[PDB]
C-alpha cells in the first residue's frame, strides 16, 4: 500500500510517500526519513487516509 508522510518541522515542511505492506512497516520507514532529515517530533496516523504526520 502507498502511505503518505506530512512533515511539520521547525525547519522542514513537506510531503513524501512510501510503499509498505502494513502501517507498522510504513511507520519504520517514515521515522527513519524524519530522523535522517533532522526532525524529532510528535506523530499521528490516520489509516483512513494512509497518512502519517510528524510535528515539532
Ligand atoms: S493527530 C493529527 C492528525 C494527523 C492526521 C493523520 C492528518 N489527522 O487526520 C489528524 C488531523 C488527526
Domains of the chain, CATH where assigned: 1-56 (3.10.20.10)
Is 4 in contact with 50 (CB distance < 8 Å)? Answer: yes
Residues 6+ apart with CB under 8 A from 21: 1
Whether residue 55 has its Cβ less than 6 Å from ligand 1: no
Whether residue 15 has its Cβ less than 6 Å from ligand 1: no
Give the residue carrying C-alpha cell 526532525: 39
Is 39 in contact with 12 (CB distance < 8 Å)? Answer: yes
Query: ∠18-41-39 over CA atoms, to 5°?
Result: 65
DSSP state of 40: -
Method: X-ray
CA of 42 to the centre of ligand 1 (A): 11
Closest C-alpha among 32, 52, 30, 34 to residue 43: 52
Burial of 36 (0-12, 13-18, 19+ CB in 10 A): exposed
Instruction: Tell me the CA distances in angstroms from 33 to 18, 47, 54, one per residue in order.
Output: 10, 19, 11
Q: Which atom of ligand 1 is nearest to the CA of 46?
A: 6
Whether residue 47 has its Cβ less than 6 Å from ligand 1: no
Tell me, in Å, the resolution of the deposited structure.
1.6
Amino acid at each position: 500500500m502507498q502511505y503518505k508522510l506530512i512533515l511539520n518541522g521547525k525547519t522542514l515542511k513537506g510531503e513524501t510517500t512510501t510503499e509498505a505492506v502494513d502501517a507498522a512497516t510504513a511507520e519504520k520507514v517514515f521515522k527513519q526519513y524524519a530522523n535522517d532529515n533532522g526532525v524529532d517530533g510528535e506523530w499521528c496516523y490516520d489509516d483512513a487516509t494512509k497518512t502519517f504526520t510528524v510535528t515539532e
